[PDB]
Structure 1
Amino acid sequence: QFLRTDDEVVLQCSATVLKEQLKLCLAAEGFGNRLCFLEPTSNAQNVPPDLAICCFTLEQSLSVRALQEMLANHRTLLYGHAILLRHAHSRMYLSCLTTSRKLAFDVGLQEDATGEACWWTMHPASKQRSEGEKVRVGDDLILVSVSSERYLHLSTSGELQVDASFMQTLWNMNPICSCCEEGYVTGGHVLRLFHGHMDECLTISAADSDDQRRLVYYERGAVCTHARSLWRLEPLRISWSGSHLRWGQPLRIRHVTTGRYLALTEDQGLVVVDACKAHTKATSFCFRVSKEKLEGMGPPEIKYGESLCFVQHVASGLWLTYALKKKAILHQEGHMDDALFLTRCQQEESQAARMIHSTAGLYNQFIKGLDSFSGKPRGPPAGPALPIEAVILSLQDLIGYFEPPSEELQHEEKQSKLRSLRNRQSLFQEEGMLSLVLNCIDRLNVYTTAAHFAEYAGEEAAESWKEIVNLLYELLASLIRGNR
């Protein structure tokens, strides 16, 4: 009934578009782009929203005097309290930025929780709540930046955005999960699906495969530690999507590094499909106890490791089965040994897998823009603008991410940090990040100078040509660095 600290939440607002209400969640990537944006959730039945980057953790909830004393150097939320919100993926903190996209400031994530910028005071939306009262689940609230004294605001030229404005917006701090039972599978969890005990898991193929990475397999060996075998369980009901999963409950299964959804198609059978084509009927599955014919955290039913689960496609009733590497299919009978167990991926690996997803998406966009004016000069590029700012920041972020530990650190800590670095390098390497970085280099090296690049791209885009190539070479080096 009440919101507490260390609860996972989403910040939701609503807007009227085409005489219909549209629910929107506060989202940010962090790496490559600090700025917050809005992720629509109303059309979930047709197109699944990108929720992994919508999740925030309530770090602290402090009174006015408690904040002031903290700046000089599980608790229930009360009105008047100032809260610190940590982004689940990037590990960064929601803040009011000093830059502007009007007397509004931009809203985004910052690297460190220092100063007032990352603090937001909670205020009642009506006379039904008062200062010092317990913040209840489902309450509309007003959020005020401690630094700028402005409201967290839904802005509208023709797009729906977030900023810090003197205009008010009502926000719903919807709980994703609360204290949940240990060892139980919940929504939003990133995991692996294992078949037997021979190091065999459900996966798509490696990068650059003739597959186009659309097919699903049972694969043995090194896959079991690679990013390509990681999946995100996404229940159809957005409310309490981070609640315990139940037998028979419909859910979508998202592939982390590609962002594609397990689906049944009329033409291809069992494949993995783009988000835009991942509608309920094709993409909805459930865990079953057997093959017999058939608003809170809820009852805990599915255990990690100990529970054996059959995967069923809901609309068709077909079972997930196999055709070492065996193709995964959907079949009316399947096989007697179809039952799978689940194992929870830890945060370093899951974080890395999402970073790869966004990194791949961004640089592939950058590559597509480069190919757009490949043999087309200007007298007016005139294709879509290259994501210069995002590419630069992405590059800088990954370089810092792959930075070796300081030689001044102690041996025990250094070795552990080196081991973590190697594992993180490996996950990127196995997802074809070297080739991808190289493809950017090779395409930019087609040009001899910045001025030559300006003859095909813009003069403004050419201003960052030398910087991007140098940062790419730097990332390339950091991806290879042995770090033994």
Structure 2
Amino acid sequence: QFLRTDDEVVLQCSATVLKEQLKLCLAAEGFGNRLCFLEPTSNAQNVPPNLAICCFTLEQSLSVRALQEMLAGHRTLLYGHAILLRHAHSRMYLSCLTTSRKLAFDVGLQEDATGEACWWTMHPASKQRSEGEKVRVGDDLILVSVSSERYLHLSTASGELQVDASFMQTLWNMNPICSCCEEGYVTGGHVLRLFHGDECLTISAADSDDQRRLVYYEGGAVCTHARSLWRLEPLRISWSGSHLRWGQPLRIRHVTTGRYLALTEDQGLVVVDACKAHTKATSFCFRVSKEKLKRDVEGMGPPEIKYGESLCFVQHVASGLWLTYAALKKKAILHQEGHMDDALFLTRCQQEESQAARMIHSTAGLYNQFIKGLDSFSGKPPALPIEAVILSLQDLIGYFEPPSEELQHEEKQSKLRSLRNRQSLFQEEGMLSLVLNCIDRLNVYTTAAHFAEYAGEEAAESWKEIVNLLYELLASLIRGNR
């Protein structure tokens, strides 16, 4: 009922697009794009809303007297406090930038929580709440950027909906996503692996004849590759990050591919594009048993499903079909009766791995777009994402860059081991081919001006930069780091 620090929230506002009141959350991508945007949560039944990129962690809520004192646990948020919001998807911080794209600033992300620019003071939106009172869940509120002293505010100019820091006010809901959970219990929004018996649930490797659409039970090294990672996403906006319960409908999202576990009329059990991932075809639940078989709480809920200790049957909700094998690599199928040994156990994946999986997804998406733009004009003299591609390239280069040679051996090796594991994950997801395709397609052009003939000078102004960054990323992915 009250928001404590280390709680997870989405900042939600309202707008009336196409003459109807749509609610939508504050979103940021992170790498490749620092600028914030808005994610519609409204059309949940037909399209899975991208809540993952909307979650922020309430890192700290301080009195201005302690906030000014800093620049030299489980506290409840009080009105008047300045808060620090950590973007969960990127581990970056919600900040008020010094760019503008009409007196206003851009709202986005800071790589590090530095200075006043990443702090926002909370203020009551009504005579019901007062300065010093605890901020209550589902309260409308006003947020003021400490550095600029402007309001976090949604724009409607001209056609599209944006976010900026303006002298205009916007009323913002803090929807709780999650709070303290019971140790070792599965909660929504968790990225995990579903094990069988070793064998785990996965899609095929990159570039497979599959088009990566089919689901498998596979053993060996997959259990340590990103392709076997899934996010459990319940059919809720608020307390989506609550404990999961037996029978609770949920979507199962494949992380790197972005597609959703689904039952199809034609294909059968497959993974499916986000836009085509409707509730009926996409809703699964965890069952204690296969026997015949309530109303969701406004909180973390009762802890029901335990990591590694709970054997779970997976069931498609609409059809009642069981996730089973077909009969080391087996096709996963949905079946009426299934197999006596269909029960999976869930192992929570760790952060370094989960982050890398999500980073793969963004980068694949951004670069596939960049390639599509290149392919669009091959032989023809569709705006290319130059700005983002450059930033993405730069970001991954720093991500992969080896430790400073003048560092202690104990830490150097440990930081080196992770770098290697981080590189491996990307490598096994065909990130090298991705970088190579971008290089090969850019190399079809001899001079920067030759590229300008098919793309224009503005785009060509960064041609030698993108190739140098791509070759640099390539090298950084390849480097042994032993």
TM exceeds 0.5?
A: yes
Runs of 4+ aligned residues of structure 1 deviating over 4 Å after TM superposition are: none
Alpha carbons 2:311, 2:344 under 8 Å: kept: yes
- Taking only aligned residues, the RMSD between alpha carbons, in angstroms, comes to 1.1
Q: Following TM superposition, by how much is the alpha carbon of 1:120 offset from its aligned partner in structure 2, in angstroms?
A: 0.2
Q: Following TM superposition, by how much is the alpha carbon of 1:282 offset from its aligned partner in structure 2, in angstroms?
A: 0.3
Alpha carbons 2:154, 2:162 under 8 Å: kept: yes
Match of 1:298 in 2: 301
Question: Residues 319 and 73 (structure 1 numbering): CA distance in 2 closer, same or farther, change over 3 Å?
Answer: closer
The C-alpha deviation readout for 1:46-69, integer Å capped at 9, x for no partner, is: 000112211111111111111111
Give 3-state SS (helix, strand or coil) of 1:44's partner: coil
Give 3-state SS (helix, strand or coil) of 1:405's partner: coil
Paired with 2:289 and 2:84, the residues of 1 have a C-alpha distance of: 45
Match of 1:147 in 2: 147
Give 3-state SS (helix, strand or coil) of 1:18's partner: helix
Match of 1:186 in 2: 187
Moved more, 73-82 or 473-482: 73-82
Paired with 1:73 and 1:116, the residues of 2 have a C-alpha distance of: 21
5+ residue gaps, structure 1: 377-383
Give 3-state SS (helix, strand or coil) of 2:412's partner: helix
Paired with 2:113 and 2:303, the residues of 1 have a C-alpha distance of: 35
Give 3-state SS (helix, strand or coil) of 2:71's partner: helix
Paired with 2:199 and 2:27, the residues of 1 have a C-alpha distance of: 35
Alpha carbons 2:82, 2:122 under 8 Å: kept: yes
Q: Following TM superposition, by how much is the alpha carbon of 1:302 offset from its aligned partner in structure 2, in angstroms?
A: 0.2
Give 3-state SS (helix, strand or coil) of 2:46's partner: coil
Paired with 2:477 and 2:348, the residues of 1 have a C-alpha distance of: 26
The C-alpha deviation readout for 1:363-394, integer Å capped at 9, x for no partner, is: 00000000111001xxxxxxx11000000000
Paired with 2:202 and 2:459, the residues of 1 have a C-alpha distance of: 39
**Pairing 1:135-174 to 2, within 5 Å after superposition:** 135-156=135-156, 157-174=158-175
Q: Following TM superposition, by how much is the alpha carbon of 1:29 offset from its aligned partner in structure 2, in angstroms?
A: 1.2
**Pairing 1:338-353 to 2, within 5 Å after superposition:** 338-353=342-357
Q: Following TM superposition, by how much is the alpha carbon of 1:88 offset from its aligned partner in structure 2, in angstroms?
A: 1.1
Q: Following TM superposition, by how much is the alpha carbon of 1:409 offset from its aligned partner in structure 2, in angstroms?
A: 0.7
Give 3-state SS (helix, strand or coil) of 1:258's partner: coil
Paired with 1:298 and 1:50, the residues of 2 have a C-alpha distance of: 23
The TM-score with structure 1 as length reference comes to 0.97
Paired with 2:111 and 2:377, the residues of 1 have a C-alpha distance of: 36
Q: Following TM superposition, by how much is the alpha carbon of 1:73 offset from its aligned partner in structure 2, in angstroms?
A: 20
Paired with 2:304 and 2:357, the residues of 1 have a C-alpha distance of: 27
Q: Following TM superposition, by how much is the alpha carbon of 1:35 offset from its aligned partner in structure 2, in angstroms?
A: 0.5
**Pairing 1:56-205 to 2, within 5 Å after superposition:** 56-72=56-72, 74-156=74-156, 157-196=158-197, 199-205=198-204
Paired with 2:110 and 2:236, the residues of 1 have a C-alpha distance of: 31
Moved more, 89-98 or 389-398: 89-98
Alpha carbons 2:5, 2:73 under 8 Å: kept: no
Paired with 1:249 and 1:4, the residues of 2 have a C-alpha distance of: 26
Paired with 2:463 and 2:187, the residues of 1 have a C-alpha distance of: 45
Paired with 1:422 and 1:237, the residues of 2 have a C-alpha distance of: 37
Paired with 1:435 and 1:18, the residues of 2 have a C-alpha distance of: 42
Match of 1:330 in 2: 334
Alpha carbons 2:5, 2:59 under 8 Å: kept: yes
Match of 1:38 in 2: 38
Paired with 1:135 and 1:467, the residues of 2 have a C-alpha distance of: 48
Alpha carbons 2:26, 2:54 under 8 Å: kept: yes
Moved more, 15-24 or 277-286: 15-24
Paired with 2:305 and 2:12, the residues of 1 have a C-alpha distance of: 29
Paired with 2:428 and 2:318, the residues of 1 have a C-alpha distance of: 35
Give 3-state SS (helix, strand or coil) of 2:455's partner: coil
Give 3-state SS (helix, strand or coil) of 1:61's partner: strand
Q: Following TM superposition, by how much is the alpha carbon of 1:200 offset from its aligned partner in structure 2, in angstroms?
A: 0.7
Q: Following TM superposition, by how much is the alpha carbon of 1:89 offset from its aligned partner in structure 2, in angstroms?
A: 2.1
Paired with 2:303 and 2:219, the residues of 1 have a C-alpha distance of: 30
Paired with 2:388 and 2:173, the residues of 1 have a C-alpha distance of: 30
Alpha carbons 2:153, 2:163 under 8 Å: kept: yes
Paired with 2:274 and 2:376, the residues of 1 have a C-alpha distance of: 25
Moved more, 12-21 or 116-125: 12-21
Paired with 1:52 and 1:176, the residues of 2 have a C-alpha distance of: 10
Paired with 1:463 and 1:25, the residues of 2 have a C-alpha distance of: 35
Paired with 2:149 and 2:319, the residues of 1 have a C-alpha distance of: 54
Q: Following TM superposition, by how much is the alpha carbon of 1:18 offset from its aligned partner in structure 2, in angstroms?
A: 2.0
Paired with 1:72 and 1:195, the residues of 2 have a C-alpha distance of: 53
Q: Following TM superposition, by how much is the alpha carbon of 1:19 offset from its aligned partner in structure 2, in angstroms?
A: 2.5
Q: Following TM superposition, by how much is the alpha carbon of 1:71 offset from its aligned partner in structure 2, in angstroms?
A: 1.2
Q: Following TM superposition, by how much is the alpha carbon of 1:111 offset from its aligned partner in structure 2, in angstroms?
A: 1.2
The C-alpha deviation readout for 1:10-52, integer Å capped at 9, x for no partner, is: 1111111223211111111111110000010000110001122
5+ residue gaps, structure 2: none
Q: 1:315 aligns with which of 310, 314, 318?
A: 318
Paired with 1:200 and 1:406, the residues of 2 have a C-alpha distance of: 39
The C-alpha deviation readout for 1:144-189, integer Å capped at 9, x for no partner, is: 0001111000110111111000110010111111111110000000
Paired with 1:101 and 1:255, the residues of 2 have a C-alpha distance of: 34
Q: Following TM superposition, by how much is the alpha carbon of 1:113 offset from its aligned partner in structure 2, in angstroms?
A: 1.3
Q: Following TM superposition, by how much is the alpha carbon of 1:72 offset from its aligned partner in structure 2, in angstroms?
A: 2.4
Moved more, 70-79 or 104-113: 70-79
Q: Following TM superposition, by how much is the alpha carbon of 1:237 offset from its aligned partner in structure 2, in angstroms?
A: 1.4
Give 3-state SS (helix, strand or coil) of 1:121's partner: strand
Paired with 1:279 and 1:445, the residues of 2 have a C-alpha distance of: 41
Moved more, 426-435 or 43-52: 43-52
Between the two proteins, what is the percent identity of the paired residues? 99
Question: Residues 63 and 335 (structure 1 numbering): CA distance in 2 closer, same or farther, change over 3 Å?
Answer: same
Give 3-state SS (helix, strand or coil) of 2:106's partner: strand
Paired with 2:148 and 2:313, the residues of 1 have a C-alpha distance of: 53
Q: Following TM superposition, by how much is the alpha carbon of 1:209 offset from its aligned partner in structure 2, in angstroms?
A: 0.3
Give 3-state SS (helix, strand or coil) of 2:352's partner: helix
The C-alpha deviation readout for 1:109-146, integer Å capped at 9, x for no partner, is: 01121111000000000000000000000100000000
The TM-score with structure 2 as length reference comes to 0.98
